[PDB]
Write a protein that binds this ligand. Structure first.
Ligand SMILES: CCCC[C@H](CC(O)(O)[C@H](CCCC)NC(=O)[C@@H](NC(=O)[C@@H](NC(C)=O)[C@@H](C)O)[C@@H](C)CC)C(=O)N[C@@H](CCC(N)=O)C(=O)N[C@@H](CCCNC(=N)N)C(N)=O
Length: 203
């Protein structure tokens, strides 16, 4: 399957005998599933993102079938709003990011998909994040009257400033669109600009 990023990349998974919906998230190191039973030895972990940290239970060697592809690995169980399939299991299903092109790279997920971007004249590092609706960057100055917004992740909500029609180059591909500026843990390129540079998920 090639999955476009016009909407959230939600797929059916099978885990612990149960069928669930989960978001394919290149911006997640780990896989985080809603409160559920996994008999097995577990250990406590805290994981973080936008809004802060949540406490989860770490189970290992849990089989997870993702759109009919078998994977097995570590699953973190806790109060997430959205079941998230992260890179630990995406790699096992041979998921890549691809920008269409006689060019456009193919990016595997064994390491975080970090890229250089140019925004406001400034080179920054940012994570290609299919789990993010929007693009969120650390405090910087951009032009415009910005609308304050709140966005959430996972650990809660944060306040951001919204800037619209901002040029952004992402590994050399041109985008112009909405950028949210605020206290994000990591600079993230979300689906609003991934779609502009032709990015798809591919198994
Ligand atoms: C639980 C909500 C969906 C999860 C994604 C996660 C993520 O954007 O991929 C981020 C990106 C990096 C940190 C910012 N990844 C993470 O948050 C993950 N963190 C990590 O992988 C690492 N943590 C750190 C600190 O980097 C690791 C060391 O623990 C965790 C899931 C834990 C594995 C997320 O936070 N998406 C937001 C991004 C902000 C945005 N505005 O786009 C989003 O789409 N939010 C929307 C909708 C939220 C979901 N809505 C829904 N109906 N399900 C919003 N408007 O509030």
């Amino acid at each position: 399957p090639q999955i476009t990023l016009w909407k959230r990349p939600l797929v059916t998974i099978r885990i612990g005998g149960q069928l669930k919906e989960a978001l394919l998230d290149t911006g997640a190191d780990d896989t985080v599933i809603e409160e559920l039973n996994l008999p097995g030895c577990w250990k406590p972990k805290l994981i973080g993102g936008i809004g802060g940290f949540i406490k989860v239970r770490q189970y290992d060697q849990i089989p997870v079938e993702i759109a009919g592809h078998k994977a097995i690995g570590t699953v973190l169980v806790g109060p997430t709003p959205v079941n998230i399939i992260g890179r630990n299991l995406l790699t096992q299903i041979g998921a890549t990011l691809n920008f269409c092109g006689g060019g456009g790279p193919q990016i595997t997920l064994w390491k975080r998909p970090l890229v250089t971007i140019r925004i406001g004249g400034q080179l920054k590092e940012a994570l290609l994040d299919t789990g993010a609706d929007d693009t969120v960057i650390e405090e910087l100055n951009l032009p415009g009257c910005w609308k304050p917004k709140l966005i959430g992740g996972x650990g809660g909500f944060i306040k951001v400033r919204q800037y619209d029609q901002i040029p952004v180059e992402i590994a050399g591909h041109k985008a112009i669109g909405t950028v949210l500026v605020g206290p994000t843990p990591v600079n993230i390129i979300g689906r609003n600009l991934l779609t502009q540079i032709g990015a798809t998920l591919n198994f």
